Amino acid sequence: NLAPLPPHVPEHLVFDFDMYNPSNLSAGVQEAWAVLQESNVPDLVWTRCNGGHWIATRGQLIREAYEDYRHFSSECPFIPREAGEAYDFIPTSMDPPEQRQFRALANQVVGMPVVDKLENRIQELACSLIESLRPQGQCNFTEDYAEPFPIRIFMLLAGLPEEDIPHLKYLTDQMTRPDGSMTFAEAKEALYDYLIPIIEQRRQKPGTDAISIVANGQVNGRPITSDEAKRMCGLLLVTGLDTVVNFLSFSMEFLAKSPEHRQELIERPERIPAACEELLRRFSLVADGRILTSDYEFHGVQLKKGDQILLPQMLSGLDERENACPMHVDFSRQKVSHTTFGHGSHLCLGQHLARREIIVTLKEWLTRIPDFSIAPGAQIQHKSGIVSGVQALPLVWDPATTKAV
Ligand code: HEM
Ligand SMILES: CC1(C)[C@@H]2CC[C@@]1(C)C(=O)C2
Ligand SMILES: [K+]
């Protein structure tokens, strides 16, 4: 329902948007959120949904807030408030200066140097997965590629058994798009229940995997603690199992519906990197936020200490103030403005791995299956939350138009 309106919030700024079930979801999740950018909606609004919280609707305010960590703290980054309070992953739940020291360590397992260590396996997996599907002329993209590709790469990197994916994927989804069976706190507890023993084992008998590296790592010259390691590894699981997985489906859904855009990349493959960037803007999918550390007047609005504010990374690039004709996909768009990977000191550290997985997927897919479409009569459904996604994506194609490599 709707939580009572705090006395410091003026009635004209109330817009009851539900980030976990937006009213215009049928038109597409990005379109659902874009309602916040209509001519009749203020730059900053208050929603009584999910306990009550502010929402910045424009790239300008979103960027500004992510830059000002003194006023907008990451200590409580998720909505509902109970989820934000329970959230303690590292380095995301910390503000500078303390946060910085952990970014260096994290970068050792998800940064550019880790992309080169797995460059070959990434290539091989994408090709093998796609070739296996090619002759079928059909597939359920979400489960047949979107999930297995990024997830298997992560599990390999982290040295975890593939048979554990179903369980880990369930827990992760409860922290971003809960089905109601588990509170964030419960999902977090379960994730740690899984990680604690593995961290202890890899600290006594270190390995070359991501978990061993973090567990036996150093932060600004001193040994990382078991607790810190646990909180960092938790974030790695979540980013490994619920980020690229969702973005790939949005991208393929669009490509299946746009023969002209597929054609463009087939005739001009060198434009794939640029197309990846434009797709990251058009189909941005993350939305978390911060908590006010004190009373603060922001753009004429009085924010009270403790107030939660959602700063949708998704909205910056969809904002027409940032990009003309924002809902249109233009691979030749001049300045692709967006905050899909975040903004401020918490800028995504795994963006190099993400882009590689995306670019490799587009290249190797169009190479083998250049002509495909959404299954006849199929109605694609999306889902909204901290990270948005696609429920299912049935694709079809004529095997005769495919090429085996
Ligand atoms: C398209 C895929 C991805 C998107 C859209 C994405 C987006 C983001 C965003 C929005 C943030 C900042 C959140 C905040 O400020 O509270 C972030 C942080 C982070 N991401 Fe990504 N991410 C993606 C993939 C990944 C992957 C694959 C990894 C790991 C290999 C990863 C690792 C991280 C880490 C470690 C942080 C936390 C950095 C910090 O808090 O200092 N991300 N990501
Ligand atoms: C908001 C995010 C996308 C960012 C990385 C995974 C995520 C869900 C977090 O908890 C941090
Ligand atoms: K917290």
Swiss-Prot record:
GO BP: (+)-camphor catabolic process
Names of required cofactors: heme
MF-aspect GO terms: camphor 5-monooxygenase activity; heme binding; iron ion binding
Annotated EC: 1.14.15.1
Record's subcellular location: Cytoplasm
Annotated residues for binding of heme: 348
Record's keyword terms, sorted: Cytoplasm, Heme, Iron, Metal-binding, Monooxygenase, Oxidoreductase
Principal location class: cytoplasm
Segments passing through the bilayer: none
Any one Pfam family match given in the protein's UniProt record, by short name: p450
One GO term describing the cellular component: cytoplasm
Pathway this chain belongs to: Terpene metabolism; (R)-camphor degradation
Catalyzed reaction equations: 2 reduced [2Fe-2S]-[putidaredoxin] + (1R,4R)-camphor + O2 + 2 H(+) = (1R,4R,5R)-5-hydroxycamphor + 2 oxidized [2Fe-2S]-[putidaredoxin] + H2O
Family: Belongs to the cytochrome P450 family.
Its biological purpose: Involved in a camphor oxidation system.
Name used for this protein in its record: Camphor 5-monooxygenase
